[PDB]
């Protein structure tokens, strides 16, 4: 009938690939790939976030699933125009990945009183959840 090979559905280093910088002074910010230098280096640019145009080792970055249309070697203003058109910031903020990053940041920020309030609320949510597991 039909053949059925799988895939392996990799994120590609390509012009327009959005990346989350992991190491350095821009760490945590997004940036687009603008040109490919070699197997390990790429030129990135993150005008919105304030990541300066720069050559960077792919080891310092994590490829995200987001890509947007961008000409090879686009200058910063062009990157900035196409980025906001493509709605890259909002697409990122909707991801489970971004939400986890945010959650981790939120929990880290909690006051000792807020931690106390959290315990009291979890005790409450637990009461009702465990009541529902008894029925079903």
């Amino acid at each position: 009938t039909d053949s059925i090979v799988k895939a392996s559905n990799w994120r590609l280093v390509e012009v327009g690939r959005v990346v989350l910088i992991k190491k350095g002074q821009s760490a945590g910010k997004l940036a687009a790939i603008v040109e490919i230098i070699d197997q390990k280096k790429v030129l990135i640019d993150g005008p919105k976030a304030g990541v300066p145009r720069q050559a960077i080792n792919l080891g310092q970055v994590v490829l995200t699933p987001l890509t947007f249309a961008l000409p090879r070697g686009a200058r910063t203003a062009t990157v900035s125009k196409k980025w906001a058109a493509a709605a890259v910031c909002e697409k990122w903020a909707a991801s489970s990945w971004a939400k986890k990053i945010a959650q981790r940041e939120r929990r880290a920020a909690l006051t000792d009183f807020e931690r106390f309030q959290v315990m009291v609320l979890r005790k409450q949510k637990r009461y009702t959840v465990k009541k529902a597991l008894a029925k079903a």
Binding site: L121, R122, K125, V129, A132, A136
Partner: protein, 197 residues
């Protein structure tokens, strides 16, 4: 953090795992290693067999019972690697090695306990893909270990029991994750989401 750590030896590199275990014990952490028969060594099988034969050649000439002793079982090959990375002739070193146990397969009581891995020693994260490697059970059998088949029979049985356990927990995890989803869109759940929970 845990009062005993149970490392699943499978898929780890002998030396890199040995080096981490040795340091943990010297720092006063009890460790158990299981599935020592599934441990790897970089280098093709033949090379590693040749190295083991070089080791077998070594013996006290005037009386072979005076050592060195050539243990063949996977667990004891791992123990040899470890013993070499600890000052095992001192009282501190003897104490450190009392904090360690190594087993082929996963005997009781450790069969019903969580098993961790050591990423700095995982073969799949360490070796360049394409590089050849030995599995320690095969090596041990070739140099005279006798219980490869018994361990394999016992491990097949344990995995049947374990798959049944998992099937049940995976079912109970649905009921929970379902009941947690109905709890969302309550006032309490929305309040918790504000505070990062």
């Amino acid at each position: 953090v845990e009062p005993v750590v149970v490392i699943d030896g499978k898929g780890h590199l002998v030396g890199r795992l040995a080096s981490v275990v040795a340091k943990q014990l010297l720092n006063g952490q009890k460790i158990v290693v299981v599935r020592a028969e599934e441990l790897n060594i970089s280098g093709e099988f033949f090379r590693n067999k040749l190295k083991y034969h070089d080791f077998l050649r070594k013996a006290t000439a005037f009386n072979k019972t005076r050592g060195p002793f050539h243990f063949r079982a996977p667990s004891r090959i791992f123990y040899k690697a470890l013993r070499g990375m600890v000052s095992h002739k001192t009282a501190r070193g003897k104490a450190a090695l009392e904090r360690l146990k190594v087993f082929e397969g996963i005997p009781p009581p450790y069969d019903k306990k969580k098993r961790v891995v050591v990423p700095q020693a995982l073969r799949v994260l360490r070796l360049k893909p394409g590089r050849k490697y030995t599995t320690l059970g095969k090596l041990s059998t070739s140099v005279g270990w006798k219980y490869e088949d018994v361990v394999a029979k016992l491990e097949a049985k344990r995995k049947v029991s374990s798959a049944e356990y998992y099937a049940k927990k995976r079912a109970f995890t649905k009921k929970v994750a379902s009941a947690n989803a109905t709890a969302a869109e309550s006032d309490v759940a929305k309040q918790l989401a504000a505070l990062g929970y």
